[PDB]
Amino acid sequence: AEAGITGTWYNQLGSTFIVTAGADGALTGTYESAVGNAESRYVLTGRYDSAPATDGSGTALGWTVAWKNNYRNAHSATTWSGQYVGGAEARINTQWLLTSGTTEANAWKSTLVGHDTFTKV
Amino acid sequence: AEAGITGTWYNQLGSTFIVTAGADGALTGTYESAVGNAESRYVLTGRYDSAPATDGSGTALGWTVAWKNNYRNAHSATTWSGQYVGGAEARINTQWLLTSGTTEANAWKSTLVGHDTFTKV
Amino acid sequence: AEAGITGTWYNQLGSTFIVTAGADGALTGTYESAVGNAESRYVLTGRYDSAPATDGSGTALGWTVAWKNNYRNAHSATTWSGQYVGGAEARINTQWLLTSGTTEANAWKSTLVGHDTFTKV
Amino acid sequence: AEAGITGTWYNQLGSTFIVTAGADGALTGTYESAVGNAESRYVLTGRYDSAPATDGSGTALGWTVAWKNNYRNAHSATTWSGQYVGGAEARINTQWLLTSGTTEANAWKSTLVGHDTFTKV
Amino acid sequence: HPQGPPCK
Amino acid sequence: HPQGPPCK
Amino acid sequence: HPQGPPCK
Amino acid sequence: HPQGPPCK
């Protein structure tokens, strides 16, 4: 984990996320939306289990991205919860929740759910 | 938001979370499990929409807690995705994902889903 | 369960659902959207654990509603997964998934997640 | 849809589900757990949008399985919410919720969330 | 959407 | 689990 | 659980 | 939305 987590990860939609896993569980980095142009970067912050494992389990982690930067404000935030599996073909398998700020009448429809698999390739 | 978010929040299970919302979207604080004894504190980090709103919408936010500190290592992490509604009775309504690190055979059952409503009282 | 489940249930949004729990696990009934006018009814079908319990556990159940009838076609379906707790104040606590049919480019945003608590009052 | 849905579907875990999509939205069939031995079959019931589409959208559907039959009673139920995409390589992409009946103290951890992709091959 | 609250 | 209610 | 993969 | 695929 940690050293294995630090780096660039790509998902099946063309998004790129670059993160540094700190010694004590911190996750810091940026998320880049497709196209890959400057203004597609958002800050991400999260945490991971720095002491995961005699039975080959994955490392639990999660991070959040608020979709606001100096070019866009999508008035929403997404959190990814999942685990890191290292090895020849390491991957981070996640499920995410994307919540948009709504008025109280639309609160019932404010959150979408999905899943993403990130690889180093 | 921001000033309205900073403070102590309590949920319907007896958990307490204290956070500081930074000027540029950062969320930093600690989560305390019930009982309220020292060793029940974990670090939390997240992000929120610092520029939410002419139609009374809530402020989207999310944060993560890895369940490891110097007394416990539950080999899991939880992410909360939701929105902050301020006013007389402010609240943060969330849905969460709790993922435990598992072996690949148990990966299909690694994530639980729930919802929490936090109030200042 | 079964006899305790059969009846009318109401949720915090003003929706009404009337169901019959069959001896062998079947759940059949109709869901009515707010207002309560004729054209607000949709068919629901589901299943429940007909043999739940020496430790006061709830009864797991789930049902589906496709949002199409002879007045409306919202091109979506919702499934509710939860458990029935009987007694003085019986309730069905659920989490739901609402998926809309989308083109492949919007598939990533096709499902919303929420929770509902139904009571007999 | 309907004719395209009727048949046998397999997921990435080795489970098989056989369903009949009725003219008016009904979904009826059986779910078989891996191994493929008799006692691995459970009844499934659901609904789908019988009138989905001039823009190639998928067909929304959902179904429920209560994990009880004459050999096993896992005191739980799962609901799958998703959409059917037909064509050369048809598939049903879903997200599911699995709820177990718990005592009230464990209700917060009663539901797991996942996703499944079913193909005809 | 039919699953929502009254719109009122 | 630390995210739960009191166990009491 | 019956919804899982083979256990094998 | 910035979390989506390319729109292309």
Curated annotation (Swiss-Prot), chains A, B, C, D:
GO molecular function: biotin binding
GO cellular component, one term: extracellular region
Residue intervals of the Avidin-like domain: 1-121
Subunit structure: Homotetramer.
Full protein segment contained here: 37 to 157 of 183
Binding site for biotin: 31, 42, 80, 96, 108
Protein name, entry field: Streptavidin
Taxonomic superkingdom: Bacteria
Keywords of the record: Biotin, Secreted, Signal
UniProt organism field: Streptomyces avidinii
Location relative to the cell: Secreted
UniProt short sequence motif Cell attachment site, positions renumbered to this chain: 47-49
Family according to the record: Belongs to the avidin/streptavidin family.
Record function comment: The biological function of streptavidin is not known. Forms a strong non-covalent specific complex with biotin (one molecule of biotin per subunit of streptavidin).
